[PDB]
């Protein structure tokens, strides 16, 4: 029966148009539970009056919504499967995924849409329970939909929801009916609004979050509102709730609040209906403002969450009470005084990653273990501040951060990447309702939460005249807290707090209308006092976080920078299946949906599963609180922490030389917040044995926090203890060398050894044990590596780009230079036997590097080997200079001397400290969705693997896969190891970068610019 | 002056429907469209978000969108008893400039008092002054010497320029003024409408 028919509610079609975001939905409020009893409020025992619609759900899907049948509604399809929700459509594979770093996927021409978009319908039945019908008001819940649904009720139409990431409510009342009722959904994965999000992540439309039916008393409290004040001292703050009734008003009607702090209240509020006689017509008939006072009230904070109880219950004057409310409070004051961040009178270094709600096995929708398993890890890792982007996060989320510890920033849901210009969306006029509902949905039902401490209205949208008139309205609405958008170049008028993306610490670019400068210059700026909080930096993306200590120390250094998130917290990527069915993760447009922004959607610093990307530690220990500073014996230790005490640190300190400790020691601390405690360690044991002594510190908790468990270490600092320096003599060994020439090749003998040199090849083709060959390849010089992320940027074969490390070097013919032999010799030493190779590597009638190399052979049989290797300085720097070597010899467990066990990279090599380290060879490699060099270690005095030692300083990565292997294969899934064990030893390597996946990230101190390069080696076996 | 048509007497509290959030969207449609077709005139030297509308979150949402908009237009507005964070200028209306009275929440001062108040930088202009209902503008020289006497007062606009009356026709036919609801519209203000300092045929009072 129409208008309940679908073609007239289809057209005039609402998702097309712009202006209507929703018709016949109620307004947004934090949730009550709408729970009758007293006690379960306080309790927060799940509550009888909420209904989930969570479970197996009826499903239909069509290419276009015309195309899906009128008569569904009446009745669910006979063909159309059953499955789970909230789920996304695309994930069960009905529709492939499809992904986009900064365009739409669908065509831009605002506000109009494709014509054909893939349409889901979810029926379900349900029955309602009959006391539900009698009394009160019943109205469906949707924490979730994407990207707009149309609501049938009973065969009936109910309503139309324009936002997918905020919770729209429909009251189903009149539609309801006793017995079962069916419910019919239709869920368009493109709409109108679709245009105000071009956030990128993988991109799925369905009902990714739950739905569940609500039942309120005629008479209930539509919203309430918690609100703290506190002195100076801080020792008293007063809490004033707001609390609005809707429908029906009676005067008899009380409504109070309780405050309870554990098991125990602390304060009670009762107030009649109605408050303050606002101006000027008249006082509000339904508001009530109730003001209790707390003194010593404990404060949250993200060492401590220090959480309140507060219940709000509407109760008759004998009285019952109608319903019950509890909201979740910490008292906190946030406010910006003199351009610095303040929380709770103390500035504020934020720590903070990125989040990206993803999972991997189930896309969109998370798991509420998920949200823990992420919380714990983030905590873990030092991090205190989590900042999502760019969305409200699930409802649950908010309220595990309260709990938990960190500080969360809420985002509203807007992103226009990909309108050019972008802030066209968001600065005209029209846009603006559509806008509006973005941000103010999003306060009404975050505002509540005590872990918030910020409001962002916009990701990446550019800056537009609605932002400017949004920032009014969070302040005047909330006044609470500070208000900081990205877009504009970060110093838009309507961010509190100035967010620059990207910006680099030591250099600034600056994009015309667009400047971007030095953090340290930033806040220089003329006429600028805002504090300075990056919304991104240190790009996780394949290898990254390079020069992230570069950052750390900038933050340190400055009242006013507060630091900034770190992106991404977690990759993106979707699960695949072989024929085989094995699982392999899918980074870009593998389902072929295009174009494809392909691999730069992961950006991650842990494994989706999740695992920790090896950039990960890096963080922690940049990120640990404790600062440690050693002079002699005496070790100073710098408190991070702004409101805790160190009740239960342990300090425990080994020192080791050689990767052998002479002595441990152990110390409590007890330090107060910013405060310095002084440790100093009995006297270090001296040893005569020439080598260098290490002082290793770092500090284990006794007893396990909620997040952590007992033994877990917050923070470690290593410091080299004075050099030792051995003049003892290797000389002499009674055996000599004796070598045998021939045209074709070189060949030297030593006992049981023999050392074969190729003089048309000119590097020496086999090692000689036995009765055995040690190498399969003949060693040669290496002056290139996988491409990092970072190196190749956004550069493709499509549309290269000249900008890019990768393109540098392929222009270069520096992947492709083919070695000479300028030069060779052969001599005889009395003790040793000397050969000297010179190799110049020309491409295109130009040489890029000249290398000499001299091995010298001892009377032990110990070879050692010198380099020296010349780049001209015309050329772009090799990535890296080493040699490598193919050895058919394979080992169960990798040992060497130097930093460890994480890989590490010059520009990051701060996490690593040095030790004797000892892994499974499977651990050298480190699996990456995107291949690229990985797995290198720095700063080895020896190598171990298998019968072979290496001795001298070096970074060595030893993996089974080729580094010609690693950068041709698209995935790492794909990589077949190579019999053999592949090893490559750097005298230097290039640092990884990079501030920016985009332009080379890549500091110049650390790029090998010297134009002249000297290493050396030793090979010996055992 | 330029005013945005939006006006909310009648609720109580009156800044209810200005203050909601939802209301926002068809709050934006009166001050934004204003704006983009009137902007281009010469004459207008403001820019006025809304007439006894009280004091809403809207108001102070709406402010700044005009400002950004345009930054050529002061911005104005009453409601908030003119105090208001939103208005560039204060607006009292009404205001007495000898004494002043005041309402919980809603207090008015004389316009000498209400520049002097602690905090406030403000040009003064009054939304309305010297009311010419009947006999009126009684006392109107003891504002106007203010004006002078004060750099900061800019003078303020006189309620009403033309009286508000329908005409009626009389069994004769002859045309008799109507105050109030003679129609028996109901309840009808009656007389107060008209609010005229010149008749509206029209005639000066
Ligand atoms: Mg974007």
Redesign the interface.
């Known amino acids: 029966m129409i208008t309940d028919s679908l073609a007239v509610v289809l057209q005039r079609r609402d998702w097309e148009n712009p202006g209507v975001t929703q018709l016949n939905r109620l307004?947004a409020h934090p949730p009550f539970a709408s729970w009758r009893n007293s006690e379960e409020a306080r309790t927060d025992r799940p509550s009888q009056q909420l209904r989930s619609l969570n479970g197996e759900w009826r499903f239909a899907w069509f290419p276009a919504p015309e195309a899906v049948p009128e008569s569904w509604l009446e009745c669910d399809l006979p063909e159309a499967d059953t499955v789970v929700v909230p789920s996304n459509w695309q994930m069960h594979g009905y529709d492939a995924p499809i992904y986009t770093n900064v365009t739409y996927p669908i065509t831009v021409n605002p506000p109009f849409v494709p014509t054909e978009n893939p349409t889901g319908c979810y029926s379900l039945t349900f029955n309602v329970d009959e006391s539900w019908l009698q009394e009160g008001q019943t109205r469906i819940i949707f924490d979730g939909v994407n990207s707009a649904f149309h609501l049938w009720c009973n065969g009936r139409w109910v309503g139309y929801g324009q936002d997918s990431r905020l919770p729209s409510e429909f009251d189903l009342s009149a539609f309801l009916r006793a017995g079962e009722n069916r419910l019919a959904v239709m869920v368009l994965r493109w709409s109108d609004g679709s245009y105000l999000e071009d956030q990128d992540m993988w991109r799925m439309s369905g009902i990714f979050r739950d739905v569940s039916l609500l039942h309120k008393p005629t008479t209930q409290i539509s919203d309430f509102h918690v609100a703290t004040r506190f002195n100076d001292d801080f020792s008293r703050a007063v809490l004033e709730a707001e609390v609005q009734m809707c429908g029906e008003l009676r005067d008899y009607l009380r409504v109070t609040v309780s405050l309870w702090q554990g098991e125990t209240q602390v304060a009670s509020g009762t107030a009649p209906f109605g408050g303050?006689?606002?101006?000027?017509?008249?006082?509000?008939?339904d508001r009530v403002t109730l003001r209790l006072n707390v003194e010593n009230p404990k404060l949250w904070s993200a060492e401590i969450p220090n959480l309140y109880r507060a219940v709000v219950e509407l109760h008759t004057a004998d009285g019952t009470l109608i319903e019950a409310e509890a909201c979740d409070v910490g008292f906190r004051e946030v406010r910006i005084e003199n351009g610095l961040l303040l929380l709770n009178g103390k500035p504020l270094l934020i720590r903070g990653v990125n989040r990206h709600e993803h999972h991997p096995l189930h896309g969109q929708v998370m798991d509420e273990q998920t949200m823990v398993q992420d919380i714990l890890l983030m905590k873990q890792n030092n991090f205190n501040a989590v900042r999502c982007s760019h969305y409200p996060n699930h409802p649950l989320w908010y309220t595990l951060c309260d709990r938990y510890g960190l500080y969360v920033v809420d985002e509203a849901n807007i992103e226009t990447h990909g309108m050019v210009p972008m802030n066209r969306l968001t600065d005209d006029?029209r846009w603006?309702?559509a806008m509006?509902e973005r941000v103010?949905?999003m306060?009404?039902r975050d505002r509540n939460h005590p872990s918030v401490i910020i409001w962002s209205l916009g990701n990446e949208s550019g800056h537009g005249?609605?932002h400017?008139?949004?920032?009014?309205?969070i302040?005047?609405?909330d006044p609470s807290r500070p208000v900081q958008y990205e877009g504009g170049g970060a110093d838009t008028?309507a961010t509190d707090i100035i967010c620059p993306m990207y910006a680099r610490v030591d250099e600034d670019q600056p994009f015309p209308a667009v400047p971007k400068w030095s953090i340290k210059k930033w806040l220089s700026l003329p006429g600028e006092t805002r504090p300075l909080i990056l919304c991104e930096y240190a790009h996780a993306m394949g290898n990254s976080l390079g020069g992230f200590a570069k950052y750390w120390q900038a933050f340190r250094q400055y009242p006013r920078l507060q630091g900034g998130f770190v992106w991404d917290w977690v990759d993106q990527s979707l699960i695949k299946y072989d024929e085989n069915g094995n699982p392999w993760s899918a980074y870009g447009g593998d389902f072929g949906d295009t174009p494809n922004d392909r691999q730069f959607c992961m950006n991650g610093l842990v494994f989706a599963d999740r695992t920790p990307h090896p950039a990960l530690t890096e963080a922690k220990h940049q990120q640990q609180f404790f600062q440690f500073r050693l002079s002699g014996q005496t070790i100073e230790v710098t408190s991070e922490y702004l409101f805790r005490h160190s009740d239960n640190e342990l300090l425990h300190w080994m020192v080791a030389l050689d990767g052998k400790p002479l002595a441990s020691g152990e110390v409590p601390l007890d330090v107060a917040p910013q405060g310095k405690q002084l440790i100093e360690l009995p006297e270090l044991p001296q040893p005569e044995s020439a080598g260098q002594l290490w002082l290793t510190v770092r500090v284990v908790q006794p007893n396990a926090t909620a997040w952590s468990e007992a033994g877990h270490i917050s923070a470690w600092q290593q410091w080299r203890l004075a050099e030792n320096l051995s003049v003892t003599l290797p000389a002499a060994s009674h055996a000599i060398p004796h070598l045998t020439t021939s045209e074709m090749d070189f060949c030297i003998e030593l006992g049981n050894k023999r050392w074969q040199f190729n003089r048309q090849s000119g590097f020496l083709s086999q090692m000689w044990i036995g009765d055995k060959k040690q190498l399969l390849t003949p060693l040669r010089d290496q002056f290139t590596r996988a491409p990092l992320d970072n190196d190749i940027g956004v550069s493709e074969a499509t549309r290269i780009d000249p900008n890019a490390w990768v393109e540098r070097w392929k222009a270069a013919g520096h992947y492709q230079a083919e070695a000479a032999l300028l030069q060779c010799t052969a001599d005889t030493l009395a003790d040793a036997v000397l050969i000297t190779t010179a190799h110049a590597w020309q491409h295109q009638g130009k040489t890029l590097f000249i290398s000499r190399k001299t091995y010298r052979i001892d009377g032990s049989g110990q070879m050692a080997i010198t380099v020296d290797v010349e780049v001209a300085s015309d050329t772009p720097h090799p990535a890296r200079i080493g040699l490598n070597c193919q050895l058919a010899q394979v080992a169960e467990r990798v040992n060497w001397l130097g930093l460890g066990p994480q890989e590490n990279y010059p520009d990051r090599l701060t996490a690593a400290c040095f030790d004797r380290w000892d892994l499974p060879l499977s651990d050298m490699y480190t699996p990456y969705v995107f291949p690229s060099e990985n797995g290198l270690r720095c700063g080895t005095r020896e190598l171990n693997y298998g019968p072979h030692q290496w001795r001298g300083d070096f970074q060595f990565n030893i993996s089974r896969y080729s580094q010609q292997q690693l950068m041709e294969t698209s995935h790492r899934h794909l990589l077949h190891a190579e019999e053999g064990t592949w090893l490559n030893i750097d005298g230097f390597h290039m640092g990884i970068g990079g501030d920016d996946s985009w332009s080379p990230s890549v500091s110049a101190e650390f790029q090998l610019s010297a134009g002249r390069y000297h290493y050396q080696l030793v090979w010996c076996q055992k």
């Open positions: 307004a303050e006689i606002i101006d000027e017509r008249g006082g509000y008939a006029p603006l309702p509006s103010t949905r306060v009404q005249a609605n400017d008139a949004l920032y009014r309205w302040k005047s609405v008028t």
